C-alpha cells in the first residue's frame with residue numbers, strides 16, 4: 001500500500017521491577033498540533049514539550065484518541081500503522097496507561113516524536129519500555 | 133490488530149536504480165496448494181517461474197532500489213479477503229530470481245514488522 005515510508009509500528013512493553021504484565025490498557029493519542037505549538041512557543045525545547053504533554057494536567061482533544069490496546073504475550077501492547085505525519089508535520093503520540101488490574105503499579109505517560117530517522121523509514125518498529 | 137507488514141528487498145553487490153514489482157498471487161497460490169494437496173514450497177517454486185503470467189489487475193506497487201540497494205514496500209496487507217496474503221516479487225527493469233512470500237502464521241500474529249528479502253542471482 002506504501003511506495004514511501006508512511007507508517008510505523010509501536011510496541012509498548014509493560015514489565016515489572018524480567019516479568020511481563022498482560023491485561024494492562026494503553027491508549028495512544030495524536031498530540032502533533034499541540035506539541036509543535038508548544039515547541040514553537042518555548043523556542044525549540046523538545047524535551048520540555050515532551051515533559052509538558054506527559055503531565056496528567058494535559059487533557060488531549062477527545063477526537064485525538066487513535067487506538068486502545070491491552071498488553072498480551074510478553075507484556076506487549078501492539079500499535080500497528082501509526083502515521084509518521086499528521087498533515088505536513090512529523091507525527092507526535094502520547095501513550096497513557098488508562099486501565100490496569102489492581103496491585104499493578106501505574107506506568108508514566110510517554111510522548112514520542114516521529115523524528116528524521118523514522119520519517120526516512122530506517123525503523124519498521126519502535127520498542128517502548130515505560131518506567132514507573 | 134496486526135493488519136500490514138513492511139517488505140524491503142535488498143539487491144546487493146548495493147545496486148540502486150533497479151525496479152522491483154510486487155504482485156498479489158493469493159488466489160492462484162491457494163488454488164495451486166489446494167490442487168497439489170498442501171505442498172507450500174512446490175506452489176512457491178511454481179509461482180516463482182518465469183512461465184507464470186500474473187493477472188494484470190494483481191500489480192500492487194513498482195519501487196526502485198535506493199540507499200543500500202533497498203526497495204521499500206510499506207503497508208502490504210497480511211490478508212487479501214479472508215485468506216493469508218501471498219506476494220510475488222520480480223525485477224521488471226544481472227537479473228535477480230523471483231520471490232513468492234506467504235504471510236504465514238508468524239506474520240499474521242504480528243511478530244515481524246519488517247521482512248528483509250535478499251534475492252539470489
Ligand SMILES: [Mg+2]
Pocket residue numbers: 007008009080081082136206207
Ligand atoms: Mg505500517
